[PDB]
Design a protein around this nucleic acid. Structure first.
Lengths: 65, 151, 65, 116
RNA sequence: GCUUGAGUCUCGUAGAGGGGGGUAGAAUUCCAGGUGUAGCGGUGAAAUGCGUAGAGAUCUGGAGGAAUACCGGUGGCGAAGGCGGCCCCCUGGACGAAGACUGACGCUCAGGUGCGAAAGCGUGGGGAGCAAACAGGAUUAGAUACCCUGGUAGUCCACGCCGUAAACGAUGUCGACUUGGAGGUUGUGCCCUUGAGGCGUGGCUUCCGGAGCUAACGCGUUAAGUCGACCGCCUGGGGAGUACGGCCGCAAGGUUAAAACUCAAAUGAAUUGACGGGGGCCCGCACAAGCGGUGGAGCAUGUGGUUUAAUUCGAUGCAACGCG
């Protein structure tokens, strides 16, 4: 949120904004509550995240590369 | 095209003095492959440019070429549902290409007597950016200036 | 991956704000247990401590006060 | 003109427009310029270049105030939020510090349903 | 009579479990004031709307209602619906340790009773934002829709009514047995806490999978497997979960629940193509970048139409029309 880079900056270097959200929560509550889709989109979020992890421990094929 | 990056054919310079840029200029004026008649016009308009300016044949064309040579053009790069233009820098081998093309098409209009009198005046007004040859370079920048917010 | 009172056992206190500042970012937000590696038992207790220190004005809710 | 020393430059970079207002340290505005006031009507209002030219047209009419150093208040996502402050640093000003003043609610009022 | 079923006590553990009462921060809205100037807002674009009565922006002060960013996690609790800022009070349920006690007190359950999302209804308040209805502006051939500007009921509270959901892991409750692995969460025992530990034993839960089952998909120690107890439900599709009558309800409506007639189908899984205003990759004067044309004029030819006694017949989207 706050960044100084006291004397020798000469450039923004403002990665502390994107270090927490800077867009994430403000482009999430500006519309679309549903009281429902946060449950559905989060059930499928970890459902696909664990299959990317399941194939992360099951990629032991030769694949000839 | 789709995949091939071509290598263009070699161009033979003008058979009066070494100038490959002039060899492409007569090709833009070129109608129905009549090279002999087309070379007679790119000559007779060139010394007549020299008597009206006191320069040589090579340097007088380059004076009028810099006023018809653009630097940025607008192309339609589709991002999604909206449709606008995108300004990009002109390639150096492309900079003269539509610059020499604008001189010919502007000399296609405004008929005084004959073609040799047309592009000779077209090179005269483009030497001090007066005629329509530089205006067709001017207005391209207006679409480039009004759409330069797309990058 | 780091560890906390799950090994060096002590009860979570809302008054020792010196240790509580290590588990909040510069914006005052609570750092998740997926970064610090703390157990879920003490993360819930830590969450109450941060909320309690925010109530007693020992830790800021944010930096925009 | 009052010859002020320092000031604060508030930036209201909304989704459709970017409002750049330079105030003093006490919050009293000294001048402003918006992307939609600098021409650019329609789709060209919400672009980082229009936010960039909004700071350039906010670089003048202040200056008579003689501002040398200023703080930047960034609010809203904006199409820019980086070009409008890059032009402010290149306008002849001293960027002391930057903070985010986005009005992020802690689950307050209910968001609308619009834009399906 | 007895103890492995069930139950009670003793000591602890976790939890958004429920009800009542306060309190904190951010944010939105509104009011007043200060600074300050032509746009603000919105969209693919635009306009309705707001603004020179001075808007938008910024600051200060104040008034209100709602909900609790981060923590936050196929994490936890509850029979289900459902429940998350913090604190005070009351209180329910679950689990673990090793003991003590009763002694089959158990399981299920038609009827019956209670709880029961949201919307809605009755009475009294409240109303910030959101938002049916409705208005205006847009799109469209038309748009009483999707878009935008507003905006009432409602969303909030107190007491009742309604008892309806795709109330769904679409899988009733209780009990026993049957390869396993990888995790989460919460107790506990032993060993060295000798070092972000090692070895076991319980409750809940997530994923993958052996046998087995299934029409297949898939389930798979929380089984849709192997067995027992009980209740409810189905007998092709439409009609129809409709009418009639009964019961409940202020109403909306809910529950019970046919028949006539009509059809030889309806349906589920999976398979091969096709299609997608689905995704990923690639190609072709397909696009792009340029040149020269047609469509404007005359003429030649062909076709259709018209006409005629005949204006022979065939081709007549691309792939017929200077064709046979």
């Amino acid at each position: 949120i706050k960044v100084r880079e006291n004397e020798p900056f000469d450039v923004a270097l403002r990665r502390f904004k994107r270090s927490c959200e800077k867009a994430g929560v403000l482009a999430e509550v500006r519309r679309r509550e549903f009281y429902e889709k946060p449950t559905t989109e989060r059930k499928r979020a970890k459902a696909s995240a664990v299959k990317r992890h399941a194939k992360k421990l099951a990629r032991e094929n030769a694949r000839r590369t | 095209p789709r995949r091939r990056v071509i290598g263009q054919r070699k161009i033979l310079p003008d058979p009066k003095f070494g100038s490959e840029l002039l060899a492409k200029f007569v090709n833009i004026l070129m109608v129905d492959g009549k090279k002999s008649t087309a070379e007679s016009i790119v000559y007779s308009a060139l010394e007549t440019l020299a008597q009206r300016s006191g320069k040589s044949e090579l340097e007088a064309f380059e004076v009028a070429l810099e006023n018809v040579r653009p630097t940025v053009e607008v192309k339609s790069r589709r991002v999604g549902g909206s449709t606008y233009q995108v300004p990009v820098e002109v390639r150096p081998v492309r900079r003269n290409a539509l610059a020499m093309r604008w001189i010919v098409e502007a000399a296609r209009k405004r008929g005084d007597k004959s073609m040799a009198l047309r592009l000779a005046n077209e090179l005269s007004d483009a030497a001090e950016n007066k005629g329509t040859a530089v205006k067709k370079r001017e207005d391209v920048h207006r679409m480039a200036e009004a759409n330069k917010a797309f990058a | 991956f780091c560890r906390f009172t799950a090994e060096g056992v002590q009860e979570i206190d809302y008054k020792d704000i010196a240790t509580l500042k290590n588990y909040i970012t510069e914006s005052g937000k609570i750092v998740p247990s997926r970064i610090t590696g703390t157990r879920a038992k003490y993360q819930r207790q830590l969450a109450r401590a941060i909320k309690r220190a925010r109530y007693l004005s020992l830790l800021p809710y944010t930096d925009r006060h | 003109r009052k010859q002020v020393s320092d000031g604060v430059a508030h930036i209201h970079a909304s989704f459709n427009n970017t409002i750049v207002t330079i105030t003093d340290r006490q919050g009293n505005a000294l001048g402003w310029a918006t992307a939609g006031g600098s021409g650019f009507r329609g789709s060209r209002k919400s672009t980082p270049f229009a936010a960039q030219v909004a700071a350039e047209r906010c670089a003048d009419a202040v200056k008579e105030y003689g501002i040398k150093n200023l703080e930047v208040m960034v609010k809203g996502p904006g199409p820019g939020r980086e070009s409008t402050i890059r032009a402010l640093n290149a306008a002849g000003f001293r960027i002391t510090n930057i903070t985010d003043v986005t009005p992020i609610p802690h689950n307050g009022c209910r968001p609308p349903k619009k834009r399906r």
